[PDB]
Every structure is written in C-alpha cells, then in structure tokens.
Design brief:
Length: about 15
Amino acid sequence: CCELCCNPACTGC
C-alpha cells in the first residue's frame, strides 16, 4: 500500500 509494507501512512513496516 505504501512502499515495502502496508502501514497507515508510516511506510516502514
């Protein structure tokens, strides 16, 4: 969803 995971606006697993 983000880049390397699907974090709620975190983007860093």
